[model samples]
Every structure is written in structure tokens, then in C-alpha cells.
Target: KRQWALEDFEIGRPLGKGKFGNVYLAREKQSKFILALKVLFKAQLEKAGVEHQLRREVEIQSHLRHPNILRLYGYFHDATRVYLILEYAPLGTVYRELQKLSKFDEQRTATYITELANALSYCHSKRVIHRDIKPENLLLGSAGELKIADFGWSVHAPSSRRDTLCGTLDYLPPEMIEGRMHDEKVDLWSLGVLCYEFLVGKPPFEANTYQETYKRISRVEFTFPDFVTEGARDLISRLLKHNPSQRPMLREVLEHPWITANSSK
Candidate 1:
């Protein structure tokens, strides 16, 4: 492991902001390896009582090795802050790109969703559950590949059916909203919501208020717009089922005709 220190990286412009502070573009002084340095204020993290989650997030990120998952190169800390060395996704985030485009073309949406499914499959196999699986948490590579960039709401091995209501409101499944024990299938539900957002330009359950959004999500009340392709619509329908057990398995999703239609096999 590389011995990390504050002065070891030449920090560049701000990449973005996180819950604690800003993520800056950085380069290692020794190897000149480009990276994103996530800086967190120690006081803020302590105030938020998220230091435990931060430790768990780092632990989960370090062990996850895949193209679709953002890597945690290492971390270091000083008196007032903690610094996380992360993989830099120079192409930026899918969240911003989606907002700019209004909505993605079906092929483009399929391309991203396919890769996300693959990433989630890998996480589940490793006993990691990404509770927050949304566009904002997804980063884009120079080659347009998608990377799961955040793990603030994740759990690793020896995980039980958890009852934590921590994911984005519009993406929560019925199980979570009902305060029931939920496992990896929660990700499947979020993936369905993400697919709807990709095609429709906003989350299907989005409403004027959080309460309304919660109600819609609890009831699985969503409608497909006329513009969405039939194949894509079918896949979304199978995934958005109210009961978690009824949702399509990730393997089934990977093999679905819609996902395989224009996907690189």
C-alpha cells in the first residue's frame, strides 16, 4: 500500500461536492496518477454521526474490484479532515448528463442499465448491497462506461434483511417504505426506478411533495409514457413489481430480450 499524506497529491480544480465537503481533482506527486480526492470535514462528519458509515463505506469500496465500480485507491487524514483517494471519472456524472439531455435515447439508456445490472450482480455476489442506486451515484468514464461512485448507504457480508430507510425517496421500494426487512432485492427495485427515470426524464414516483412521493412508491404507482419502447417497457414492468419477490431476478434482467437486443454480448 502507498503511504498516503496530505502533501503527496497536487490538488486541482473541484470535481464536485459530497455530504461532508468537496471532491477535488488530484494527481499523485510520485506516480502522477490522476484521481478524485474526496475531502471531508472531521467536525461535519462527527456532527452527522456518519463516521461509522464512512468507515464501512471505505471498507466496502476497497474490496470491490470491477470496471463498473469506482475504486478507493486509499485514504489519509489530518487534524480537521479525511481524504479519500478515488478513481477519477473525467467524463463526469450520468446525473448531470441526463439532466442536460432531458432524457436518454433507448439504446443509450439500455447501455447504461445493462452495465449497472452487471455491477449490481457483482456487488450482490460479494455480499455488498448498494442501498442508493440512482443516477447521481453513477459516474461516467471517458469511454462512456457507467461506474457506481458512492457507497454511503451500503452494507457488506454477513448482512441481514435490514430495516433502514436511507435511500432516495423516489427510488424506495414497498418493502423499505413499509419498514419491512429488505435485502439485496431493494437494489432491483431501484434499478427499475432508474430505468423509468432514464426513459422519462424523471423518477416515476416523483411528486409535488415527499409525502406524495412516498405514497406513490409505497403503492408502486407509476405509468409508462407512450414514448418508451415496448421492449424497454416490458423489462421495467417486470422489475417494478410491488412485491420484492416478484421482481425479476438480476440474472433474468441480464438475459431479458430488451437488455440483450442491442447489447454487446
Candidate 2:
């Protein structure tokens, strides 16, 4: 792939804003390929001591090709900033949609999670662990197709275990809080929390304070809202197991009754 010069693409309005940078709409001048251009300041990343993270993100995401996983075309850096060309998901992000509706039906939630499970399974097969699996990181394409859009906290496992304490507070698994080693199963736990939030409008372990939330997570104490269907409740339970080894496999999640029942719809 050729290194993209800024002039080779025409920039458009801001698509989304992030803590360190912003994503903008753009099109390659020659290929006419529309893409999301994420711009990050080098100084800010260096000050945060996360330059290495950006490199790994580009490296990991660039090699991945999947419908539900956002694609990283290539990256280029100028004197002060770095630009990453990415797949443009015109339907925007799942986070805003969830916020707008407050919650979703079991069918929609199941469908979204099903797509995510396939993408995550693909990543896991390649030793890639998406430590952070939250609504905010999920993007929707033109047809409202769910795509895992961010990989800043993702890593390629060296020994099938990692002790890094990363990811959103609510999505953190008990093993992470206990300072124990974890593997791809951590993603499953996060997915469980995400599924709960999808149907309830908030994370299952959310509380008044971080300490309280952490305590709830540690105990795996969460009650389903009365509106949650029986099948959803059962699936959530299996995914949110306190023991990593006990959590249902991604394949199992895709094959779960609730997911299959909604497949034909």
C-alpha cells in the first residue's frame, strides 16, 4: 500500500469526536473511495505515553478484513499529526442509537450480539483480544450493520494470557479487578455486560460510585430488569460467569436458542 498524502484526499465534516482526536469524512481523490479519516496529534499521544498503542492499533486493524470489523486502510504522519484512513460507517455508532432509544428489543440486541460474536470469534482465532467491548466502540454501517470500530485496547496475545488492567470500568471482568491473568474470555464477560446494557439501557454492574460498581462486578451480582425475556436472561447468565473457564464459548453464543430463533427474522 502506498503512503497517503493529505492532498490525495478531500476532507469533509467531522463525523465523530474523541478524547485525543476527531474522525472526519473524506474521499480519495483518485479511487473515489469514501473513508473515515481519523486525525491524532503526535504531541498529545506522546504526552499520554500511548504512541506505542497507536502503532499497535494500526498494525492490528490493518491486517483484519471482516464485514463486522472496521477496516484500517493505511496511516500517514506529518510533522505534528498522524492520519488513519478507515472504513466509513454511515449509520454512525451504536452508542448514540442506544442512547436515543434507551434500550432495544431482544431481537435487535440478539442480532447485534450475534454479529459481534462472529467478529470477535474471528479475532480470537487470530490471538487478538478486544479487551474493550462497549457500545461506544460499536459502529453501524449504512444498513445498520454492527461493526467493532475501535481497537486501541486490543492486543495480540503472546501466551494466551494477559494481566493488563484496561477497558471501561463497567465492562471489566472480575479477573481483571482481582489482578489475575485473563484471556479472550474477558471479551465474553464484556459482551455479557454489553448485552445487559443493550436490553436495560445501562450496564448491569453500574452503581453510584466506582467502588460500589467494582464491588458489584466482583460479586457478579446483577438482576435482570423485569422486561428482559427468559432466553436473554439465560444467555446473559452463561456469558457473565465469574469463572473465565465457565463462560460460554463464542460459538455457543451464536448457536444459542435466542440467537437462532431470531435468525430467520
Candidate 3:
């Protein structure tokens, strides 16, 4: 691959602004390839003691080439900052859409879930675990295709289990909340939570306080709204099992009635 530099791109408008820095819409001078240029301040990352985390994110995401997984084509850095050249999902984050609509219809949710399950399955096959799988980390491509964007909390553990309590509080699995070792199954739990959130417009285990949320998560305490279909409810129930081993594999999720019901793809 050719080396990337700031001079190679013609920066356009700001795509989004984050804690560390901002993402800019840019196009390469030669190829005219449009992309999301994620600029991160080195000082912020160093202050947060998460520089290595960023490196791992790059290491893992750059190697992944799935259609549903946003591509990290390459990266470059200077003394004060690092820049990541990413595939631009023009439609933006799923979180933004969810916020506007307050929720997704069953058909849309089912399609997204199917796409995500396939993407997650691909990641697992590569021994890559995307610890965070929320709407905020998911982007929509030109055709409204769902794409997993951020890999900041991801890990590349082949067969070993992890003990880190990473990812958002609402999506935490029972084993993680109880401080037990967890494997790829943690992603399955998050998928279940994501499904519920997609339909209900909020996380299933959300509560007034963090403690209460943790309590609910540990117990897998949640209920679907009356609008959620029985098939969707059953799929969520199977994925949200208290025991990790009891959770269905991603392939099984893809084969579930809820996913297959309206899916013509």
C-alpha cells in the first residue's frame, strides 16, 4: 500500500466531532476516492492512556474486508495527531437514524440484524471480537446497508477468554457484569440488546442508576414492548440467555424465524 499523508487529501466539511478530535469528509487527490478521515489528537489519547488501544483497533480493523465491516484502508500520524482513512458510509450512524425515528420498524430491524449477524459471524471466524456493538458504532452505507464502524473496544483473541469489563454498560453480558471470564459469546449478548434497542428505541436493561442497570443486566431482566412480534421476542430471549453457552450462535440467529420472516436477501 502507498503511504498516506495529509497532503494527499482535499479536506471537505466536518463529518462529525468527537471527544478526541473530528472526522472530516475528504477526497484523495489522485483517485478522488471519498472517505471519512478520522483525526485523533495524540495528546488526548496519551492522556487517556489508550494509545495502544487505538493501535490495536487499527491492527484489527485494517485487516478486515467484509462488506458490512467499515474498512480502515490505512493510517498516518504526525507529532500531535493520528489520521485514519476510512470508507465513508454516507448515510451516517444508525444511532442518528434511531434518534430521529425513535425506533425502527420490524422489517428494517430484521434486515439490520441479519446484516450484523453475518458481519459478527465473519469477525468471530477471524478470531476478532467486537466488544462494542451498539447503534452508535454502526453506520449506514449509501444503500442503507449496516456497517460496523468502530473497533476501539475490539480484541483479537483466538481461543482465550477475556476478563476486561469493556463496552457500554447497557450492553454488558451477565458474565461480564459479574466479573467472570467471557468469550465471543459476549457479542451475542450485545446483539440481543442491540435488537431490543432497535425496536424499542432504548436499551432493554436501562434503569435510573448505573447500579440498577447492572443489576438488571446481571439478571437479564427486560421485557419487549407489546408492538414487538413474538418471533422477535423469541429471538431476543434466545440470545439474551444468562449462560453464555446457552446463547445461540450467530449462524443460528441468522436462521431464526424473526430474521428469515421478511428477509428476501
Candidate 4:
């Protein structure tokens, strides 16, 4: 195995600051490969008691191979901190862009939905469930291609189902909120919420308070603005089904008329 060290790369400017660490642009001395270096403090991780969770995140993300999924090249640790080598997404995060624009056009929204559906399909095929799929977990490559960037809440479950109540409140599916067992279909629900947010500028179930949001999510209650087209509404409706089993699968989403009509490629 090749040993990695901080001295092996030329670290550049900071990309972003995180709760446990910071991400920086870097270049490998040997291959001149550009990448992002995530530096995590051991003390902070220990205090949070998430070392095992971090291990699982690295294991799952490093093994996944897909165009829309960010790559975890490798990782290493020293006396005080752990270092993660990641693919550099020059275009930055989708959340930041969404904040800047307040919303997205149909064409951009459709393209993002297509990319995410394809990525989530690949993840499900690998027996991995991405519990979190909000805009904050998405990034853009050089060509503005969407990438699933974070896997902190991902799980490689090859079993029947999962029951842990995870993910953001607005994106939570009915089953998760009700404490029912869930499967990969949860990602579909989140995708629906993400699509709605893209077009409407806020999550479908977002409310003034957490309790209100919970109730709305539990009932799968949401409405579309007039600006949302019929096809787009249809797709969102299909993905947001309260019955997880009834939600359209990723392949179906990819084949939906709205995606076909608005997708650039």
C-alpha cells in the first residue's frame, strides 16, 4: 500500500470550512493530479464519537464508481488529524448555487434530476442507501455535472430494510417519519423534495416550525406553484408517493417525459 502524507501534495487555497475540519485544494507531486484535501481533527471526531461513522463513510464512498458520485481517492492519518483525498469539484456545491439563484430554471432542474436519478440508481444497485440527498450533499464538476458529494449518512445494507430515522426533516419520507422500515426508496422521496425545492426555492414541506414540518412530511402534504409545469408536477408527484413501494423507481424517473423533454443531453 502507498503511504500518504501531507508533504506529498502541494496544498493550495481553502475550499470550504466544515464542522469538523476544512477542505483545501491540492495537487499530488507524483501525478500532478488535482484534488481536494479534507483535514479532520482527531480530537473533534473523538468528541463527537463518530469515528466509526467516518470509517463507514470512507469505505462506502471510496468503493462507489459513478460519474455523478464524487470520488474518495484515499485517506490517511497522522498524530492529530485524518486526511481525506477527494476529487476536486471546481464548480462548488449545488447548495451555494441554489442560494445565489434562489431557484432554478426547468432545464437546469430537469438535468439535475436526471443526473441524480442515475447516481441514486447506481447506489441502490450496489446495495448502498444514501440516507441524505439534499442540495448540500451535491456538488458540480468542471462541466457543471452534478455529483453526490457527501456520504456521511450512507449505509451499505444488503438486507431487507432499515429503520433508523435519519436525513433532513423536509426530505424525510413518510415511512422514516413514522418509524417504519425503509429501503432505497427513501432516496426517491428525497429526490422529489429536492426537485420541488429546485423549482420553488424552498422544500415542499418546509414550515415555520419543526412540528409543522413533521406533520406535513408525515402526510406527504405539498403544493406546486403555478410556475411549475404539468410534466414537472407529475414527476414530483410520482416520486413523493407516501407509499415507498409505489414511488417511481430511478429508471422510471430517468424515462419520465419531463426528463426526456427538458434534459439537455
Candidate 5:
């Protein structure tokens, strides 16, 4: 893929910032389409020994072709940095939408969750595990469809037992918090967290500090309220299973009674 330079880019625009880097909201000079140009320092990668993971993320996500996964238009490397040019998601993450509405109607949440499930099933089938599958990593395209972004924490899983420790505190699977190796079931844990937030208007577990957050995640003690229907609780219960070996797989999740409850409506 073709690469771009800082000088070649328009340079000044409102981009978004993450913990260690920023993503520029940009446009191709000769074209009408917009893009999010993620810029990162090579020194930082070297300093953190994240080059291997970085390469893996770029390489794996580079080959993914899905409606929800953000399209990797191209990437390039300069003497001082690596640039990842991706499809611009206009409305940002579904997190923003969830926050805006505080929660979503059953039909709306079902549709988006189903779309995300399809994306996850595709990734798992290809042995590409998205380590970070939270709402922060999911965005909206210009056309309003969901687009999963952020390849920094992604990993190419092995055939089995592809265990690597990473992801947000709020979404860690029980096994992960227990310091036991786990597979893609961690994604299910995240989906459960997202689902709870989607249905209950707040995360199932939220704490003031990371340690407290970690404690709650490890315990996995949470309950959905009356507003959350029985079927919905049943769905989250399966996903938030302490044992990764027992969590609901993507296909099962898609066909769960809670998910399919209003299919005829």
C-alpha cells in the first residue's frame, strides 16, 4: 500500500488522542473520501518492545475484509514513524451512541450486536483474535454502519491456546483476571460488559481506580436490574461465565433467545 508523509498530509485538523498517540482526521488530496490517519513514533514502539505486536496488528488487520472492521486503505513508514491510513468513521465509536442515548431499544441493540457478532465470528474463523473488542474500538462509517477500529491491541491467534494478556480492565474475562491463560472467549466477556452497558445505562462493574476495577472484574459479581429482561440476563449470564470454556460462542449468541426474541417483530 502507498504511504503518506507529514508534509504530504494537510497537517492541521482536529484529530483524536489515545493513551500514547493520536489519529488524524484527514483527506486524500486528490480524492473526495476522508480518512483517519493514525500516527505513532517508532521510538515508542522500540521503547516498549511493541514492534512485534505492532507488526502483527497491522499485518493481521490488513487482511481482514468485513463490514464492521475498518478498512485499511494503506500504510507507509517514514524515517521517524509508521502511518496507518484507515477508513474514516464519522460518528466515532458506538460507545458515544450508547452514552448519548444512555441505552438502546431492544431492536436497535439487537441489530448492532448482531452485526458485531458477524464481525467477531469472521475474525475468530480466521484465527485473528481482536484483543480489544470494546465499544471504544467500534465506530461508525460515513454511511452509518458499524466499523471496528484500533488495531494496536490485536493479535493473530494460534490454532488454539493463543493466549496473550491484554485488554481494558472493565472487559477482562474471569480467567484473565485469575491470571490463567484464555482464548477468544475474552471477547465474549467484553461483549457481555458492552451488553450490560447497552441495556442498563452503566457498566456492570465500574470503580474509581484500576485496582478496584480489577477486583470487581475478578469477582464477576454483577446483576442486571428489572429493566433488563430475563432473556437478556440469561444472555449476559452465559457470556460472563467465569469459565471461558463455557461461554456462549458467537453463533450461539446470535441465536440466543434474547437476541432473537423480536425477530418476528
Candidate 6:
């Protein structure tokens, strides 16, 4: 449990900013350790009902103990804001690199996928589900290890299903689109989309309207380009299935030919 004052944080240093509040770079006054401090305003969250949505995030994130996940130092609060102390990902998000340059190499992709799967599998075992699992949330630490960031849509599962549709448009599965109950399989579905985007530079489903997008995701027959490797296509096809019952679990996915070709020492 650590807290950093604003005066101790350096200006001009941005952790990551989004539609949500800004995550800033701060230095712990005593330890001098750099941290990513996510400062969210209470009024904004209350207005958007982001409290419940993000509460799930805070709960799910604080409970995780995986190295592949961004470490939660703890949280601080007051009348106006909730300050979340988080680990800084020095290397930033992989999405930026993909946007600036190109796709990740085979080894990087496989290694990252393995790490992601391991973390996600761990989450599943704990009955937690990360609803968002895209390249944008995969941040790199100072040592350049990939860590899962952004808990906007993550949930802590209990004995039963909690139904409330949430997640990025591109990553949502058929059940999510249909407003049905789902679990960690949602993350697997999103990762399938990420795997495609990682190699191909575009999502498997894209549309101008939310309805059309959901329609496409519900169809389950989006074609694979000839250039896409068979293994990736095969994996994508399975992950994108309409029936969550049929979607390949992480272990089955790791056993696929694409993983075999891409994963090695």
C-alpha cells in the first residue's frame, strides 16, 4: 500500500489516457519508484454509473496475483475522487507499436499469446472473467514483459452468471452481443479477434453501426482471407463460433497447429 503526492510526480509524463480519467506517471516520494496512478473523478463515474462498472474492475484487478497482469499497489479515496495506485508499464501498450509499425513477429505473437492465455487461464480458475483482452490492454513493463491492463469490463465471477453486456465492440462474443450470460470464454473470444488483428491488421468483424456489427458476429461465417494461414483461420473460426459451448477452450487452442508452429523455446 503506497501513495504518491502530485508534487512528487513529474509533469509531461503520461501513463495512458482514454475516455476514462487519465493515468499519470508518478514517483513514490520515499522509494522513488515510478508508478502509474489512475485518478478517476467521482462525479463523472456517478453520472455514467461507471461506479458499478468500474467497481467490478477494481474488485477483479485487486484480487489477481499474476505477473502478466499489471500490479495493483492499492487505492486511495476522498470526497471527489478515487485514486488507484498501479504499476507503470514502461513499454506502453502493444497496440501503439502495431499501429506505428506492423504486426508482431511469429515468436512475439506466440509468446505473448501464451503469456496472455496463462494469465487468463489463471483468472478463469479463480472464477474471474476479463471481458476485454485486446492488444490495447497488453502493456509492457520496464523489463518489456506483457501485462494485462485496463479493467473497464472485467468481472469477478461467483457461483452463477452475471448478465450485463459490456466490452469493446470488436471483441464481443455472440453471447455478449445477444445479452446472454457468459464467463472467461468472453476473453478467449476477444483474444481470437486480437490474434487475427495481430497478424492481419484488422478485426474479424467491423461495421459502422452497432446493430450490423452484432449481426455479423452472430452469423459466425465471416470468411478468412486466402493469405491468412490455415492454422490461424482454423483457430479464428473456432473462437468466433456462435455457440459458446463449441468455442475452443484455452487448452484446446494452445494445442492447435498455429500454436505449435508459433510456440517454441
Cα RMSD (angstroms) for every candidate in the order listed: 6.2, 6.3, 6.3, 6.4, 6.6, 6.6
User: How close is every model to the real structure, measured as TM-score?
Assistant: 0.90, 0.90, 0.90, 0.89, 0.87, 0.85
> What C-alpha lDDT values do all the predictions have?
0.81, 0.82, 0.83, 0.83, 0.73, 0.71
Candidate 2 lDDT score at position 59: 86
What are the per-residue Cα lDDT tens digits for candidate 3 across 148-238? 9766433221222331332358887888878889999999998899999999998898876778888888877898888888988999999
Regarding lDDT, does 4 or 5 come out ahead? Answer: 4
Candidate 5, residues 1-265, lDDT tens digits: the string is 2446665565435456543456877877666457877877778778888887787778878888998888887788878878888777777777667767878777776767777788888899989764476666778777657777758533221222222222356776767767787788888888888788778877887766667778777777787787877778888888887778888889998899878874322
**lDDT tens digits, residues 109-225, model 6?**
766777778888888888878546677677887775778885742322122122122235778788887888886678878878888887777677766666777778888646665
lDDT of 1 by residue, 28-66 (tens): 998898998888887888897889778877887888899
Off by over 4 Å in 6: 1-12, 52-57, 152-168
What's model 1's TM-score? 0.90
Give lDDT tens digits, candidate 4, residues 1-265: 3889999999998777666778888999889999988888878889989998888778888898999998889999989989999998988878778878999988999999898888888888888885477886788998979998775332221222222322358877888888889988899999999999999988999886778889888887899988899999999999899888899878898899989899984
Ranking by lDDT: 4, 3, 2, 1, 5, 6
Worst 10 residues of 2 by lDDT: 154-163
Please list all clashing residue pairs in model 2, or write none if there are none.
none
Clashing pairs in 5: none
Could you tell me which residue pairs clash in candidate 1? none
Model 1 alpha-carbon drift over 4 Å, by segment: 152-167
Error of 5 at 102 (Å): 1.7
For model 4, what is the alpha-carbon lDDT of residue 165?
26
Residue 68 alpha-carbon offset, candidate 4, angstroms:
0.7
